[PDB]
Design an enzyme around this catalytic site. Structure first.
Site: not given
Length: 198
Positions: A36, A63, A141, A143, A159
């Protein structure tokens, strides 16, 4: 730039994410991160400088993604823990009940345990199934950031999670935290990647 897990990088001068792990695909250098975080061949920057582009991704459903870096970057078998580091020593998957930490640009280095596997994340974009759930905290952030055991076994990439009103789940007890990561092994095999270890 020096490629270390957990550090910040921007995508097309817009969103921010965290580096997962340094990897190579043959002679090519790169790092795995969350799908993402970018789109096919979007530009990634560290220290305001271009380092590479998103070579591939799968989001939603899964993801995952890997950023193909130019030869100018320096790959390292590291994950950020404050000013120090955790050495990436392998990719042995830890079982439910195991301790595990994560690293990211928003909440830094956080630890917890693995409460479940094969968890579903019905994100705004669609479902993402097959994730692993830990109770270490995280926030907006983080991620793409590294999930690794204190023994150095790379587990996966950040994720998502049950973000509270302030943006993370560090303000609530671990018992209420649903922090989810994409398993590393299927990312490595799908893109023919080798984990850089020390």
């Amino acid at each position: 730039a020096n490629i270390v897990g957990g550090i910040e990088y921007s995508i097309n001068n817009a969103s921010l994410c965290s580096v997962g792990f340094s990897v190579t695909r043959g002679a090519t250098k790169g790092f795995v991160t969350a799908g993402h975080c970018g789109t096919v061949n979007a530009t990634a920057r560290i220290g305001g400088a271009v380092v590479g582009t998103f070579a591939a991704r799968v989001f939603p459903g899964n993801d995952r993604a890997w950023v193909s870096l130019t030869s100018a970057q320096t790959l390292l078998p590291r994950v950020a823990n404050g000013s120090s580091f955790v050495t990436v020593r392998g990719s042995t998957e830890a079982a439910v009940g195991a301790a595990v930490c994560r690293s990211g640009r928003t909440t830094g280095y956080q630890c917890g345990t693995i409460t479940a596997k094969n968890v579903t994340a019905n994100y705004a974009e669609g479902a993402v199934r097959g994730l692993t759930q830990g109770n270490a905290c995280m926030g907006r952030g983080d991620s793409g950031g590294s999930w690794i055991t204190s023994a150095g076994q790379a587990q996966g990439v950040m994720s998502g999670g049950n973000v509270q009103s302030n943006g993370n789940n560090c303000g609530i007890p671990a018992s209420q935290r649903s922090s989810l990561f994409e398993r590393l092994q299927p990312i490595l095999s799908q893109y023919g990647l080798s984990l850089v270890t020390g």
